[PDB]
Amino acid sequence: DERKKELVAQLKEEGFSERDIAEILGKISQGYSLIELERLNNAIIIILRKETEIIILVAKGEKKRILSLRGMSKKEIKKKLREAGLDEKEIEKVLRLLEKE
């Protein structure tokens, strides 16, 4: 679990709180290894992957939402990321990150 330790260390460098790390690491322990993490304005995009199932945790202030991408198209993802509270450009950036993988 040394790689998991590295992920936590990175979260500390990013500036996540104990509870924030616990949430992310919690998902990692559930199999959803942290793949990508980037803050878009006031909403933090946290991308985790378990096998072929990818989830996105969006942390926008006090609003946190998790979107599963399993069986979701880019158009459907856009709609759900809009519900999360992302705009056109922010959603695009997220989709680009997913395309990068």
Side-chain angles (χ1 to χ4, degrees), residues 87-101:
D87 70 22
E88 179 74 31
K89 290 179 180 178
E90 289 169 335
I91 292 169
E92 179 182 344
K93 289 178 181 180
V94 171
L95 291 172
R96 286 181 182 275
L97 290 172
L98 293 173
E99 289 173 347
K100 289 178 180 180
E101 188 178 4

mmCIF file with all atom_site columns, all heavy atoms in Angstrom, residues 87-101:
data_model
loop_
_atom_site.group_PDB
_atom_site.id
_atom_site.type_symbol
_atom_site.label_atom_id
_atom_site.label_alt_id
_atom_site.label_comp_id
_atom_site.label_asym_id
_atom_site.label_entity_id
_atom_site.label_seq_id
_atom_site.pdbx_PDB_ins_code
_atom_site.Cartn_x
_atom_site.Cartn_y
_atom_site.Cartn_z
_atom_site.occupancy
_atom_site.B_iso_or_equiv
_atom_site.pdbx_formal_charge
_atom_site.auth_seq_id
_atom_site.auth_comp_id
_atom_site.auth_asym_id
_atom_site.auth_atom_id
_atom_site.pdbx_PDB_model_num
ATOM 1   N N   . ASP A 1 87  ? -19.610 24.518 -15.432 1.00 0.00 ? 87  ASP A N   1
ATOM 2   C CA  . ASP A 1 87  ? -20.038 25.201 -16.647 1.00 0.00 ? 87  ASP A CA  1
ATOM 3   C C   . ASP A 1 87  ? -19.457 24.532 -17.887 1.00 0.00 ? 87  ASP A C   1
ATOM 4   O O   . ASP A 1 87  ? -18.790 23.501 -17.794 1.00 0.00 ? 87  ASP A O   1
ATOM 5   C CB  . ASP A 1 87  ? -19.620 26.672 -16.610 1.00 0.00 ? 87  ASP A CB  1
ATOM 6   C CG  . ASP A 1 87  ? -18.115 26.865 -16.738 1.00 0.00 ? 87  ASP A CG  1
ATOM 7   O OD1 . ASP A 1 87  ? -17.464 25.980 -17.240 1.00 0.00 ? 87  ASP A OD1 1
ATOM 8   O OD2 . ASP A 1 87  ? -17.632 27.894 -16.332 1.00 0.00 ? 87  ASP A OD2 1
ATOM 9   N N   . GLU A 1 88  ? -19.714 25.125 -19.048 1.00 0.00 ? 88  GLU A N   1
ATOM 10  C CA  . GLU A 1 88  ? -19.332 24.521 -20.318 1.00 0.00 ? 88  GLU A CA  1
ATOM 11  C C   . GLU A 1 88  ? -17.839 24.219 -20.357 1.00 0.00 ? 88  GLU A C   1
ATOM 12  O O   . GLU A 1 88  ? -17.430 23.107 -20.695 1.00 0.00 ? 88  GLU A O   1
ATOM 13  C CB  . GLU A 1 88  ? -19.705 25.443 -21.482 1.00 0.00 ? 88  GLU A CB  1
ATOM 14  C CG  . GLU A 1 88  ? -19.333 24.904 -22.855 1.00 0.00 ? 88  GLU A CG  1
ATOM 15  C CD  . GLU A 1 88  ? -20.227 23.781 -23.305 1.00 0.00 ? 88  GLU A CD  1
ATOM 16  O OE1 . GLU A 1 88  ? -21.378 23.782 -22.941 1.00 0.00 ? 88  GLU A OE1 1
ATOM 17  O OE2 . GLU A 1 88  ? -19.757 22.923 -24.014 1.00 0.00 ? 88  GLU A OE2 1
ATOM 18  N N   . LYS A 1 89  ? -17.030 25.213 -20.010 1.00 0.00 ? 89  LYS A N   1
ATOM 19  C CA  . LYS A 1 89  ? -15.581 25.091 -20.107 1.00 0.00 ? 89  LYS A CA  1
ATOM 20  C C   . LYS A 1 89  ? -15.039 24.117 -19.068 1.00 0.00 ? 89  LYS A C   1
ATOM 21  O O   . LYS A 1 89  ? -14.149 23.318 -19.356 1.00 0.00 ? 89  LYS A O   1
ATOM 22  C CB  . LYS A 1 89  ? -14.915 26.459 -19.944 1.00 0.00 ? 89  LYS A CB  1
ATOM 23  C CG  . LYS A 1 89  ? -15.139 27.410 -21.111 1.00 0.00 ? 89  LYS A CG  1
ATOM 24  C CD  . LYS A 1 89  ? -14.463 28.752 -20.868 1.00 0.00 ? 89  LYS A CD  1
ATOM 25  C CE  . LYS A 1 89  ? -14.696 29.708 -22.028 1.00 0.00 ? 89  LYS A CE  1
ATOM 26  N NZ  . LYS A 1 89  ? -14.073 31.037 -21.788 1.00 0.00 ? 89  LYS A NZ  1
ATOM 27  N N   . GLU A 1 90  ? -15.581 24.190 -17.857 1.00 0.00 ? 90  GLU A N   1
ATOM 28  C CA  . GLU A 1 90  ? -15.152 23.317 -16.771 1.00 0.00 ? 90  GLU A CA  1
ATOM 29  C C   . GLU A 1 90  ? -15.438 21.856 -17.095 1.00 0.00 ? 90  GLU A C   1
ATOM 30  O O   . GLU A 1 90  ? -14.601 20.984 -16.863 1.00 0.00 ? 90  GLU A O   1
ATOM 31  C CB  . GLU A 1 90  ? -15.849 23.706 -15.466 1.00 0.00 ? 90  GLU A CB  1
ATOM 32  C CG  . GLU A 1 90  ? -15.382 25.029 -14.874 1.00 0.00 ? 90  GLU A CG  1
ATOM 33  C CD  . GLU A 1 90  ? -16.252 25.504 -13.743 1.00 0.00 ? 90  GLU A CD  1
ATOM 34  O OE1 . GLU A 1 90  ? -17.398 25.124 -13.701 1.00 0.00 ? 90  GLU A OE1 1
ATOM 35  O OE2 . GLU A 1 90  ? -15.769 26.246 -12.921 1.00 0.00 ? 90  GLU A OE2 1
ATOM 36  N N   . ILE A 1 91  ? -16.625 21.595 -17.631 1.00 0.00 ? 91  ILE A N   1
ATOM 37  C CA  . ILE A 1 91  ? -17.004 20.246 -18.035 1.00 0.00 ? 91  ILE A CA  1
ATOM 38  C C   . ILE A 1 91  ? -16.098 19.729 -19.145 1.00 0.00 ? 91  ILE A C   1
ATOM 39  O O   . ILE A 1 91  ? -15.644 18.585 -19.107 1.00 0.00 ? 91  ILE A O   1
ATOM 40  C CB  . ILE A 1 91  ? -18.469 20.205 -18.506 1.00 0.00 ? 91  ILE A CB  1
ATOM 41  C CG1 . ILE A 1 91  ? -19.416 20.450 -17.328 1.00 0.00 ? 91  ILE A CG1 1
ATOM 42  C CG2 . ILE A 1 91  ? -18.777 18.873 -19.172 1.00 0.00 ? 91  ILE A CG2 1
ATOM 43  C CD1 . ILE A 1 91  ? -20.850 20.692 -17.737 1.00 0.00 ? 91  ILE A CD1 1
ATOM 44  N N   . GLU A 1 92  ? -15.839 20.578 -20.134 1.00 0.00 ? 92  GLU A N   1
ATOM 45  C CA  . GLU A 1 92  ? -14.921 20.238 -21.214 1.00 0.00 ? 92  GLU A CA  1
ATOM 46  C C   . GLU A 1 92  ? -13.573 19.783 -20.668 1.00 0.00 ? 92  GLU A C   1
ATOM 47  O O   . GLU A 1 92  ? -13.029 18.766 -21.101 1.00 0.00 ? 92  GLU A O   1
ATOM 48  C CB  . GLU A 1 92  ? -14.726 21.437 -22.145 1.00 0.00 ? 92  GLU A CB  1
ATOM 49  C CG  . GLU A 1 92  ? -13.759 21.190 -23.294 1.00 0.00 ? 92  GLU A CG  1
ATOM 50  C CD  . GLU A 1 92  ? -13.563 22.399 -24.164 1.00 0.00 ? 92  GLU A CD  1
ATOM 51  O OE1 . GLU A 1 92  ? -14.363 23.300 -24.085 1.00 0.00 ? 92  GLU A OE1 1
ATOM 52  O OE2 . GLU A 1 92  ? -12.612 22.423 -24.909 1.00 0.00 ? 92  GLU A OE2 1
ATOM 53  N N   . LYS A 1 93  ? -13.039 20.540 -19.717 1.00 0.00 ? 93  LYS A N   1
ATOM 54  C CA  . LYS A 1 93  ? -11.748 20.223 -19.119 1.00 0.00 ? 93  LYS A CA  1
ATOM 55  C C   . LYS A 1 93  ? -11.771 18.854 -18.451 1.00 0.00 ? 93  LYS A C   1
ATOM 56  O O   . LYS A 1 93  ? -10.817 18.085 -18.558 1.00 0.00 ? 93  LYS A O   1
ATOM 57  C CB  . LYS A 1 93  ? -11.348 21.297 -18.107 1.00 0.00 ? 93  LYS A CB  1
ATOM 58  C CG  . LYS A 1 93  ? -10.964 22.635 -18.725 1.00 0.00 ? 93  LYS A CG  1
ATOM 59  C CD  . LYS A 1 93  ? -10.632 23.664 -17.656 1.00 0.00 ? 93  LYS A CD  1
ATOM 60  C CE  . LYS A 1 93  ? -10.274 25.008 -18.271 1.00 0.00 ? 93  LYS A CE  1
ATOM 61  N NZ  . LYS A 1 93  ? -9.958  26.029 -17.236 1.00 0.00 ? 93  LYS A NZ  1
ATOM 62  N N   . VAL A 1 94  ? -12.867 18.557 -17.761 1.00 0.00 ? 94  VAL A N   1
ATOM 63  C CA  . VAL A 1 94  ? -13.045 17.256 -17.130 1.00 0.00 ? 94  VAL A CA  1
ATOM 64  C C   . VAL A 1 94  ? -13.067 16.139 -18.166 1.00 0.00 ? 94  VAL A C   1
ATOM 65  O O   . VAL A 1 94  ? -12.424 15.105 -17.992 1.00 0.00 ? 94  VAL A O   1
ATOM 66  C CB  . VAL A 1 94  ? -14.356 17.229 -16.321 1.00 0.00 ? 94  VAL A CB  1
ATOM 67  C CG1 . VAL A 1 94  ? -14.653 15.819 -15.835 1.00 0.00 ? 94  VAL A CG1 1
ATOM 68  C CG2 . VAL A 1 94  ? -14.262 18.195 -15.150 1.00 0.00 ? 94  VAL A CG2 1
ATOM 69  N N   . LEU A 1 95  ? -13.812 16.356 -19.244 1.00 0.00 ? 95  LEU A N   1
ATOM 70  C CA  . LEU A 1 95  ? -13.914 15.371 -20.315 1.00 0.00 ? 95  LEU A CA  1
ATOM 71  C C   . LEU A 1 95  ? -12.564 15.142 -20.983 1.00 0.00 ? 95  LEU A C   1
ATOM 72  O O   . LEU A 1 95  ? -12.229 14.019 -21.360 1.00 0.00 ? 95  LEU A O   1
ATOM 73  C CB  . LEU A 1 95  ? -14.938 15.829 -21.362 1.00 0.00 ? 95  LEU A CB  1
ATOM 74  C CG  . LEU A 1 95  ? -16.402 15.824 -20.906 1.00 0.00 ? 95  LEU A CG  1
ATOM 75  C CD1 . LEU A 1 95  ? -17.269 16.475 -21.975 1.00 0.00 ? 95  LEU A CD1 1
ATOM 76  C CD2 . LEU A 1 95  ? -16.846 14.394 -20.638 1.00 0.00 ? 95  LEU A CD2 1
ATOM 77  N N   . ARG A 1 96  ? -11.790 16.213 -21.125 1.00 0.00 ? 96  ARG A N   1
ATOM 78  C CA  . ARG A 1 96  ? -10.452 16.122 -21.694 1.00 0.00 ? 96  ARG A CA  1
ATOM 79  C C   . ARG A 1 96  ? -9.533  15.290 -20.809 1.00 0.00 ? 96  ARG A C   1
ATOM 80  O O   . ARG A 1 96  ? -8.725  14.503 -21.302 1.00 0.00 ? 96  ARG A O   1
ATOM 81  C CB  . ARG A 1 96  ? -9.853  17.508 -21.881 1.00 0.00 ? 96  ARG A CB  1
ATOM 82  C CG  . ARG A 1 96  ? -10.440 18.309 -23.033 1.00 0.00 ? 96  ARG A CG  1
ATOM 83  C CD  . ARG A 1 96  ? -9.797  19.641 -23.159 1.00 0.00 ? 96  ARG A CD  1
ATOM 84  N NE  . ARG A 1 96  ? -10.380 20.425 -24.236 1.00 0.00 ? 96  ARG A NE  1
ATOM 85  C CZ  . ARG A 1 96  ? -10.017 20.336 -25.530 1.00 0.00 ? 96  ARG A CZ  1
ATOM 86  N NH1 . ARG A 1 96  ? -9.072  19.497 -25.892 1.00 0.00 ? 96  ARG A NH1 1
ATOM 87  N NH2 . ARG A 1 96  ? -10.610 21.095 -26.437 1.00 0.00 ? 96  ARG A NH2 1
ATOM 88  N N   . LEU A 1 97  ? -9.660  15.470 -19.498 1.00 0.00 ? 97  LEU A N   1
ATOM 89  C CA  . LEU A 1 97  ? -8.913  14.666 -18.538 1.00 0.00 ? 97  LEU A CA  1
ATOM 90  C C   . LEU A 1 97  ? -9.278  13.193 -18.653 1.00 0.00 ? 97  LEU A C   1
ATOM 91  O O   . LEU A 1 97  ? -8.418  12.319 -18.537 1.00 0.00 ? 97  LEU A O   1
ATOM 92  C CB  . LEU A 1 97  ? -9.186  15.157 -17.111 1.00 0.00 ? 97  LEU A CB  1
ATOM 93  C CG  . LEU A 1 97  ? -8.589  16.524 -16.752 1.00 0.00 ? 97  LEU A CG  1
ATOM 94  C CD1 . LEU A 1 97  ? -9.103  16.960 -15.387 1.00 0.00 ? 97  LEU A CD1 1
ATOM 95  C CD2 . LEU A 1 97  ? -7.070  16.433 -16.760 1.00 0.00 ? 97  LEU A CD2 1
ATOM 96  N N   . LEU A 1 98  ? -10.558 12.920 -18.881 1.00 0.00 ? 98  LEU A N   1
ATOM 97  C CA  . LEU A 1 98  ? -11.029 11.553 -19.067 1.00 0.00 ? 98  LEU A CA  1
ATOM 98  C C   . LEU A 1 98  ? -10.500 10.959 -20.365 1.00 0.00 ? 98  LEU A C   1
ATOM 99  O O   . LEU A 1 98  ? -10.178 9.772  -20.430 1.00 0.00 ? 98  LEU A O   1
ATOM 100 C CB  . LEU A 1 98  ? -12.563 11.517 -19.068 1.00 0.00 ? 98  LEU A CB  1
ATOM 101 C CG  . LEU A 1 98  ? -13.238 11.874 -17.737 1.00 0.00 ? 98  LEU A CG  1
ATOM 102 C CD1 . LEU A 1 98  ? -14.746 11.953 -17.938 1.00 0.00 ? 98  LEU A CD1 1
ATOM 103 C CD2 . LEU A 1 98  ? -12.880 10.830 -16.691 1.00 0.00 ? 98  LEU A CD2 1
ATOM 104 N N   . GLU A 1 99  ? -10.413 11.790 -21.398 1.00 0.00 ? 99  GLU A N   1
ATOM 105 C CA  . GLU A 1 99  ? -9.860  11.366 -22.678 1.00 0.00 ? 99  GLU A CA  1
ATOM 106 C C   . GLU A 1 99  ? -8.375  11.050 -22.559 1.00 0.00 ? 99  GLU A C   1
ATOM 107 O O   . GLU A 1 99  ? -7.875  10.120 -23.192 1.00 0.00 ? 99  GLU A O   1
ATOM 108 C CB  . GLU A 1 99  ? -10.078 12.448 -23.739 1.00 0.00 ? 99  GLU A CB  1
ATOM 109 C CG  . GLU A 1 99  ? -11.524 12.605 -24.187 1.00 0.00 ? 99  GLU A CG  1
ATOM 110 C CD  . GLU A 1 99  ? -11.727 13.779 -25.105 1.00 0.00 ? 99  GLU A CD  1
ATOM 111 O OE1 . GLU A 1 99  ? -10.839 14.591 -25.205 1.00 0.00 ? 99  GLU A OE1 1
ATOM 112 O OE2 . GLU A 1 99  ? -12.772 13.864 -25.706 1.00 0.00 ? 99  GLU A OE2 1
ATOM 113 N N   . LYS A 1 100 ? -7.673  11.831 -21.745 1.00 0.00 ? 100 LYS A N   1
ATOM 114 C CA  . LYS A 1 100 ? -6.267  11.571 -21.457 1.00 0.00 ? 100 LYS A CA  1
ATOM 115 C C   . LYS A 1 100 ? -6.092  10.259 -20.704 1.00 0.00 ? 100 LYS A C   1
ATOM 116 O O   . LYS A 1 100 ? -5.184  9.481  -20.995 1.00 0.00 ? 100 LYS A O   1
ATOM 117 C CB  . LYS A 1 100 ? -5.663  12.725 -20.654 1.00 0.00 ? 100 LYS A CB  1
ATOM 118 C CG  . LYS A 1 100 ? -5.472  14.010 -21.447 1.00 0.00 ? 100 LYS A CG  1
ATOM 119 C CD  . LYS A 1 100 ? -4.909  15.120 -20.571 1.00 0.00 ? 100 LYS A CD  1
ATOM 120 C CE  . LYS A 1 100 ? -4.726  16.409 -21.360 1.00 0.00 ? 100 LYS A CE  1
ATOM 121 N NZ  . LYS A 1 100 ? -4.175  17.503 -20.516 1.00 0.00 ? 100 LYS A NZ  1
ATOM 122 N N   . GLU A 1 101 ? -6.967  10.020 -19.733 1.00 0.00 ? 101 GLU A N   1
ATOM 123 C CA  . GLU A 1 101 ? -6.960  8.767  -18.988 1.00 0.00 ? 101 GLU A CA  1
ATOM 124 C C   . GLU A 1 101 ? -5.749  8.678  -18.069 1.00 0.00 ? 101 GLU A C   1
ATOM 125 O O   . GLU A 1 101 ? -5.754  9.248  -17.013 1.00 0.00 ? 101 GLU A O   1
ATOM 126 C CB  . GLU A 1 101 ? -6.971  7.575  -19.948 1.00 0.00 ? 101 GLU A CB  1
ATOM 127 C CG  . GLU A 1 101 ? -7.167  6.225  -19.273 1.00 0.00 ? 101 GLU A CG  1
ATOM 128 C CD  . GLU A 1 101 ? -7.224  5.084  -20.251 1.00 0.00 ? 101 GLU A CD  1
ATOM 129 O OE1 . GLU A 1 101 ? -7.040  5.320  -21.421 1.00 0.00 ? 101 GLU A OE1 1
ATOM 130 O OE2 . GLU A 1 101 ? -7.449  3.976  -19.828 1.00 0.00 ? 101 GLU A OE2 1
#
